[PDB]
Amino acid sequence: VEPVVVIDGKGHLVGRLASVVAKQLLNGQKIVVVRAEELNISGEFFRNKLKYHDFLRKATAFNKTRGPFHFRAPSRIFYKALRGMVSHKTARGKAALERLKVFEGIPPPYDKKKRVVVPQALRVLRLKPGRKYTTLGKLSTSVGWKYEDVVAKLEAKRKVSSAEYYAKKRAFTKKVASANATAAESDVAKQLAALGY
Amino acid sequence: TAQQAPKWYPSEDVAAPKKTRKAVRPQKLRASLVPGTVLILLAGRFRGKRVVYLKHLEDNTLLVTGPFKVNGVPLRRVNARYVIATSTKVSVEGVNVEKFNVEYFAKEKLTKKEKKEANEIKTERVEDQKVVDKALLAEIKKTPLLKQYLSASFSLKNGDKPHLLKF
Amino acid sequence: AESHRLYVKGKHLSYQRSKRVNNPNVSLIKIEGVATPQDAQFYLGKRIAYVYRASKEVRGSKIRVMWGKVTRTHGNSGVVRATFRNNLPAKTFGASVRIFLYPSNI
Amino acid sequence: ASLPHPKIVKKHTKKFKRHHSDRYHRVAENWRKQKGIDSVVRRRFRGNISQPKIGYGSNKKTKFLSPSGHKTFLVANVKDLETLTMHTKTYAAEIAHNISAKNRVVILARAKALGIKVTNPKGRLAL
Amino acid sequence: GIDHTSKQHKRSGHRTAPKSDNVYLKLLVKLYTFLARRTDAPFNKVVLKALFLSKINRPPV
RNA sequence: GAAAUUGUUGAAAGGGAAGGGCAUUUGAUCAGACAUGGUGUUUUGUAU
RNA sequence: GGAAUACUGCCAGCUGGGACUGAGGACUGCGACGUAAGUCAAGGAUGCUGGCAUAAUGGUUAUAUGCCGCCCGUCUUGAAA
RNA sequence: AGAACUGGCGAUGCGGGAUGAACCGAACGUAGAGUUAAGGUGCCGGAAUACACGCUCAUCAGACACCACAAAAGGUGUUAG
RNA sequence: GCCCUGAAAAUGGAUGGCGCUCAAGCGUGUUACCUAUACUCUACCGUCAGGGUUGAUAUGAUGCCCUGACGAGUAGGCAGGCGUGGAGGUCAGUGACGAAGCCUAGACCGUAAGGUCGGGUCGAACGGCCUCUAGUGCAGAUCUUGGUGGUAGUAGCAAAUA
RNA sequence: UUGGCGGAAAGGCCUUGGGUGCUUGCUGGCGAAUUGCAAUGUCAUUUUGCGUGGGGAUAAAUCAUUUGUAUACGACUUAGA
Ligand SMILES: [Mg+2]
Ligand SMILES: [Mg+2]
Ligand SMILES: [Mg+2]
Ligand SMILES: [Mg+2]
Ligand SMILES: [Mg+2]
Ligand SMILES: [Mg+2]
Ligand SMILES: [Mg+2]
Ligand SMILES: [Mg+2]
Ligand SMILES: [Mg+2]
Ligand SMILES: [Mg+2]
Ligand SMILES: [Mg+2]
Ligand SMILES: [Mg+2]
Ligand SMILES: [Mg+2]
Ligand SMILES: [Mg+2]
Ligand SMILES: [Mg+2]
Ligand SMILES: [Mg+2]
Ligand SMILES: [Mg+2]
Ligand SMILES: [Mg+2]
Ligand SMILES: [Mg+2]
Ligand SMILES: [Mg+2]
Ligand SMILES: [Mg+2]
Ligand SMILES: [Mg+2]
Ligand SMILES: [Mg+2]
Ligand SMILES: [Mg+2]
Ligand SMILES: [Mg+2]
Ligand SMILES: [Mg+2]
Ligand SMILES: [Mg+2]
Ligand SMILES: [Mg+2]
Ligand SMILES: [Mg+2]
Ligand SMILES: [Mg+2]
Ligand SMILES: [Mg+2]
Ligand SMILES: [Mg+2]
C-alpha cells in the first residue's frame, strides 16, 4: 500500500519476521528494517550462543577466506536468516534482495518516518508467557560485534529528540481536538454524523 | 514435367452451410438498469463521468446523456457492460426519447483514400440535445447536490474496494 | 480531482506451478484489498492490462499493453488465476498490473 | 482468391533437430533417432528435446496447404502451367529453379492470362 | 491406463483383397464383392473368400 | 573451390564452463491476404 | 402437550456470476409449443458492432527472465561415473 | 549366499520420497478445459503463520513408511493412570 | 506418555535449506486449498475393427464416406515411406538468355527421412514419373587416408674456458 | 526572505515577513459533443548528447632517464627546468 514500508524490528522474532519480509520482497514491496539489535530469537541466550558457535566452526578447510562468512552484526544476522528464505542465486532473488535495507538503530533517513510492526512475528503475541528468549544485540556482542555502545548512545540521542517532537505533536493534537469539539453540535456535524462521519 | 500430375483434383464448388438453429431472442438487461438511473462510465473518452440513462436501444446499447449542460457528455450510446448502475435515480417521464434509435447515430463510413495526414456537428443533434437536457435539468434541480454530483467525476481512492463498495 | 484511477491495482506473483515445473500459460495475480475467495469471486471475468514502456515508438506511442482476464480464484487468500493473450514475460514477477471494472455486473 | 478452408493449425512448428547436432559439427541437424541404451532423449527424460511422432500430424483438410490456402505445383513450361487451368482456387504454380529468365517471362504472362497464382514471380527478374 | 484383456491393434488374420495382381481376378472380386454386399446369399460371400485364397489353399479339382 | 581451422569488419552476450527444453518480453528480419463477379456506366482509348 | 430447528436425503424446483470449446456443412431423425399456419434452445454458432489493413497479429532468429535439462556410444543386474 | 508365490526393475518416462533402477501414485499419440492420486500448504515453493483438544523446553530438543540406526538400565523433570 | 542421562572419530555441514518453541515439534480430529503424461468431456493425428457406396457426369472401388475402441517399450519381428550410383520406358522434360556443384541466424511443404523456392558464386550438363538393379545412407570401430586445431609464440635453442 | 535546529548515511525539519496565483466555504453565467459502443489511449523519472546565454577555474599522470631502503618480470621507493 506504501512505496517503502519501514519495520521496527524491536520485539520481533527473527525467523517469523524474515519469512514475512522475504515474501513481501518477492512480491515487490520495498522494505527497510530498523533497530535490528532489538530483534528476538526464541530460546535461551546460551542455546543461541551455542548455535552460533556451531555455525562459526564451519569454514572451508583449505582456505578460510572462501568459506561460509560469519557476519557478526545483528542486521547481517537478520540478513542471513532472510537470504536463506530467498532464492538468492537467481536474478529474481537478487532483485528481491536489493529491494531491502537492514539497519542497526534508526538512521537519519528513517528516524523521521513512520515505523510499523508485523503482529504475526511479534514476540509478545507469539511466544507463550514464560518462555525464555534472546536479544540479538547481546548475542552479536558476545560473538564479536563491536558497535553495541555507540548504537545505544545514538539511540538515546534520537529518543530525546523524538520525545521533544512528540510533546509538540500532542499539544497541537489537543488544540485540534478542542477546535473540532467546539465546532461539533452544528448542522454540518449532525449531517455528517447521520451519514456516518 | 517437373512435377508429374495429381490423379484426382478436388472440386472447386463451395458447399452451402447447414441450416443453423440460433434464433435471436432479445437481450435481458440486468435489474439495476432502469431508465432514469445515474451511471458511472467505466471506459471511453468520458470514463469516470456520471450520466443519466434514458432508453434501451435496439442493438443492445444504452442511450445516455450527461446532460451536456452539466458535465459535457452529449446524447450518446454506451455498452451496458461498461457502466456501473448506481442507486441514484431521477424521473425521466417527460422526455421525447423515441426519436433516437440505431440509425440516428450513423457514422458515414470513411473511404480508404481519405487518409488524414494531419487532420462539423449536426444542428439537428445540438437542438435535440438542448430539448432533452432542458427537460432533464428541470428534474435534476429538485434534489440538492445532484447537479454537482453529476458534474464531478468518479475515481477510486486509496483503500476503496469495489467488491465492498455500494453504488 | 488529483486521482483518476478507474482500475484496481494488482501484482503479478508467479506462473501456475507444481514444486519444480511451471505452466506459463496461467499467471497468478494478487489483487489488493481481496483476502478471501468469496471476495475474489467479484473480479472473475474482469479485464487485466499489464502496461509497460519501450524505447522504440511503434504506432504513435512508447507505451505497450498485454491484455488478459481473471478466470478463477486460487487458494484460500484471494489470489486469482489470470490468462493473457500472450503469456506474461516472467521478469514481471512482482510487477504491478491493472484490473478494470469492466465487464460490469453492478 | 483461394478456396475457403479452416484455420491452419501447425501442431509443432519448431524443427526437430538431431541430438548433439549443436554439440558437434560432424553431427548434422537432419533428424535421426537415438538408439543408445542410456540415451536420455530416447528414454524421454524431462527437459530434453522432443521427438517426431504421429500425433504431430497435420489436419488432413489443411495438410499441404500454403498460408494463402493453395497447394504448390512445380511447373517447367506453359504446358505444365495449363494443367492448373480449372484448379486456380486450389493450386498455385511455382516455376522450377532451373527455368531461364526468358522462359519465366512467358510462363508469367500465360499465368496472368489464365488467372493462376504464381508463388515466385520475382525469380531471375531484371530491373 | 487400461487393463487390456486382449491384444491391441491386432489384424483380423484373414486375407481380404487377394495378393495376386491379376487384373481379371480383380475384376472378378469386384463383381463378387458387389454381389456379396447386396444379395444376402451365403454363396457369394463363400466364393469371394475363396477368390482371395492362395495357391496351396486352392488345390485342383 | 566444401569443412575443420584463421584474419578483418559488423551485431550481440558474458560474477567458477558452454550448449539445450517450454513460455513470453525486447531488438533485428520476413512471407501471406488485400484486386474480388457486382447494381453500375458519375466514363475516357467508346466498346474499353 | 403442541410446535420449531438441526442433521441426512429427494425434486423430470427457480435463478445470478466465471472459464474453455464452436467439431460438422443442402434436406432427411427424434421431439417440444400451437386448432392450424408455422415456430423452436429439437442429429455440433450465429447475430450485431468497432479498430487496423500494416510488420499491427504472426513466423524466424539473437538475447533476457522463470522453472527444468549430467556425455554420447558400449558391455552390464546396475553408467554422469 | 540359496529356494517358494506374487508384483516389479531390466525394457519406463511422468507426479511424490531433496537426491536415488526397484518404494508410493500412476504407466506415456498431439492439444484445451475440469477434477484428482501419492505427497503437501511459514519462506525458499503452487497451496490455511487454518480450526480444535492436549503433551514437550533439550548447556547433543524434535520433525514422517522403504531410509540412511540406537539398547539394557535410570530420573520428586513434567503428565495421566 | 513426552523430555533428559546412558550417547566416543577423525576436511566444515546438513529434519533438503533457512529457520521454528501455546511450533513451522509430538499424538489426534475436522474442513478448505495446491497439482501428474492418471480420470471426465472436446478437437486433431495414426492404428485396428465393423459397416455404407458401381448409378448417371469426371476422374482415383487399393476411391469416397459412416461408427466404435485403442496408442509405453530394449533385444527382436513386420509394414509403409525418404535419399544415392547405374539400367529399360516416357514427359517431342530443364539448360550457355546459365546445367551440375557450393554458400545463405531469407521463404514454403512434410510427424519425419526429406522436398521445394529466392539470392550469391559458377561454368556444361541434369531432372519428374512408371519400372529394373546394387560396391546404396556413418559419430563412434586405440577405424583408413588426407587435412587442421588447442596446447603455444609455450618447452626450449645452457657440454667442448672467449 | 529572516532566524534557527539536525553529522548515524546530517542533504532534512521548523520558523519571520512581504509578493503573487488558486480556493469547491456559499450563489451565478458560458464552454465541452465526432476518440463515433471499449482499446494504457500516452500526463512518470533515469541517463546521455548537441545548441544557445550567463557565471567560474587555468592541471597532472605515464613512458623514457635516475635511485637501491625495492625487485624474477611487472610492481615499489627516490631524483631530475
Ligand atoms: Mg553439428
Ligand atoms: Mg538401460
Ligand atoms: Mg581455383
Ligand atoms: Mg569455414
Ligand atoms: Mg438440507
Ligand atoms: Mg516480428
Ligand atoms: Mg508477436
Ligand atoms: Mg521475437
Ligand atoms: Mg541461445
Ligand atoms: Mg534459459
Ligand atoms: Mg537442475
Ligand atoms: Mg559388474
Ligand atoms: Mg541386458
Ligand atoms: Mg515403472
Ligand atoms: Mg506461496
Ligand atoms: Mg515419568
Ligand atoms: Mg535421545
Ligand atoms: Mg514443511
Ligand atoms: Mg498435527
Ligand atoms: Mg492439466
Ligand atoms: Mg474398413
Ligand atoms: Mg491411452
Ligand atoms: Mg556402382
Ligand atoms: Mg546454377
Ligand atoms: Mg551457416
Ligand atoms: Mg568448359
Ligand atoms: Mg559399402
Ligand atoms: Mg567421419
Ligand atoms: Mg554408432
Ligand atoms: Mg581416431
Ligand atoms: Mg622459452
Ligand atoms: Mg638445455
From Swiss-Prot, chain A:
The UniProt entry's GO CC annotations, sorted and at most eight, read:
cytosol; cytosolic large ribosomal subunit; nucleolus; ribosome
Query: According to its UniProt record, where is this protein located?
Result: Cytoplasm
Fill in the subunit field for this protein: Component of the large ribosomal subunit (LSU). Mature yeast ribosomes consist of a small (40S) and a large (60S) subunit. The 40S small subunit contains 1 molecule of ribosomal RNA (18S rRNA) and 33 different proteins (encoded by 57 genes). The large 60S subunit contains 3 rRNA molecules (25S, 5.8S and 5S rRNA) and 46 different proteins (encoded by 81 genes).
Family annotation (PANTHER family)? LARGE RIBOSOMAL SUBUNIT PROTEIN UL13 (PTHR11545:SF3), RIBOSOMAL PROTEIN L13 (PTHR11545)
HAMAP family given for it? Ribosomal_uL13
Q: Which family does it belong to?
A: Belongs to the universal ribosomal protein uL13 family.
Q: What is this protein called?
A: Large ribosomal subunit protein uL13A
Species of provenance: Saccharomyces cerevisiae (strain ATCC 204508 / S288c) (Baker's yeast)
Curated annotation (Swiss-Prot), chain B:
Q: Which domain of life does the protein's organism represent?
A: Eukaryota
Any one GO CC term of the record: cytosolic large ribosomal subunit
Q: Name one Pfam family in it.
A: Ribosomal_L6e
Q: Does the keyword Membrane apply?
A: no
Positions of region (Disordered):
1-21
Q: Which residues carry this modification: Phosphoserine?
A: S11
Q: Which SUPFAM superfamilies match?
A: Translation proteins SH3-like domain
MF GO annotations: RNA binding; structural constituent of ribosome
Name the InterPro entries for this protein: 60S_ribosomal_eL6, Rib_uL2_dom2, Ribosomal_eL6_CS, Ribosomal_eL6_KOW, Translation_prot_SH3-like_sf
Its quaternary organisation is: Component of the large ribosomal subunit (LSU). Mature yeast ribosomes consist of a small (40S) and a large (60S) subunit. The 40S small subunit contains 1 molecule of ribosomal RNA (18S rRNA) and 33 different proteins (encoded by 57 genes). The large 60S subunit contains 3 rRNA molecules (25S, 5.8S and 5S rRNA) and 46 different proteins (encoded by 81 genes).
Q: What is this protein called?
A: Large ribosomal subunit protein eL6B
- As recorded in Swiss-Prot or TrEMBL, the protein's gene is named RPL6B
Recite the UniProt keywords alphabetically.
Cytoplasm, Isopeptide bond, Phosphoprotein, Ribonucleoprotein, Ribosomal protein, Ubl conjugation
Instruction: Tell me the protein family, please.
Output: Belongs to the eukaryotic ribosomal protein eL6 family.
Q: Does the keyword Ribonucleoprotein apply?
A: yes
Gene Ontology biological-process entries: cytoplasmic translation; ribosomal large subunit assembly
Its annotated compartments are: Cytoplasm
Swiss-Prot record, chain D:
Q: Can the keyword Amino-acid biosynthesis be found in this entry's annotation?
A: no
Residues annotated with Phosphoserine modification: S39
Q: Where in the cell is it found?
A: Cytoplasm
Q: What are the recorded GO MF terms, alphabetically?
A: structural constituent of ribosome
InterPro entries according to UniProt: Ribosomal_eL32, Ribosomal_eL32_CS, Ribosomal_eL32_sf
Quick one: a GO biological-process term for this protein? Answer: cytoplasmic translation
Query: Ribosomal protein among the record's keywords?
Result: yes
What Pfam family is a match, any one?
A: Ribosomal_L32e
Supply the alphabetized keyword list.
Answer: Cytoplasm, Phosphoprotein, Ribonucleoprotein, Ribosomal protein
GO cellular component terms listed in the entry, alphabetical order: cytoplasm; cytosol; cytosolic large ribosomal subunit
Q: How does it assemble?
A: Component of the large ribosomal subunit (LSU). Mature yeast ribosomes consist of a small (40S) and a large (60S) subunit. The 40S small subunit contains 1 molecule of ribosomal RNA (18S rRNA) and 33 different proteins (encoded by 57 genes). The large 60S subunit contains 3 rRNA molecules (25S, 5.8S and 5S rRNA) and 46 different proteins (encoded by 81 genes).
Any idea what job this protein has?
Answer: Component of the ribosome, a large ribonucleoprotein complex responsible for the synthesis of proteins in the cell. The small ribosomal subunit (SSU) binds messenger RNAs (mRNAs) and translates the encoded message by selecting cognate aminoacyl-transfer RNA (tRNA) molecules. The large subunit (LSU) contains the ribosomal catalytic site termed the peptidyl transferase center (PTC), which catalyzes the formation of peptide bonds, thereby polymerizing the amino acids delivered by tRNAs into a polypeptide chain.
Family, as annotated: Belongs to the eukaryotic ribosomal protein eL32 family.
Q: What's the protein here called?
A: Large ribosomal subunit protein eL32
Primary gene name: RPL32
Swiss-Prot record, chain E:
**UniProt-annotated location(s):** Cytoplasm
Residue numbers bearing the N6,N6,N6-trimethyllysine modification: K49
Q: What more is known? A: There are 2 genes for eL18 in yeast.
Describe the task this protein carries out.
Component of the ribosome, a large ribonucleoprotein complex responsible for the synthesis of proteins in the cell. The small ribosomal subunit (SSU) binds messenger RNAs (mRNAs) and translates the encoded message by selecting cognate aminoacyl-transfer RNA (tRNA) molecules. The large subunit (LSU) contains the ribosomal catalytic site termed the peptidyl transferase center (PTC), which catalyzes the formation of peptide bonds, thereby polymerizing the amino acids delivered by tRNAs into a polypeptide chain.
Give the family from UniProt: Belongs to the eukaryotic ribosomal protein eL18 family.
What quaternary structure, including any partners, is listed in this protein's UniProt entry?
Component of the large ribosomal subunit (LSU). Mature yeast ribosomes consist of a small (40S) and a large (60S) subunit. The 40S small subunit contains 1 molecule of ribosomal RNA (18S rRNA) and 33 different proteins (encoded by 57 genes). The large 60S subunit contains 3 rRNA molecules (25S, 5.8S and 5S rRNA) and 46 different proteins (encoded by 81 genes). eL18 interacts with NAP1.
Protein name, UniProt field: Large ribosomal subunit protein eL18A
Organism for this UniProt entry: Saccharomyces cerevisiae (strain ATCC 204508 / S288c) (Baker's yeast)
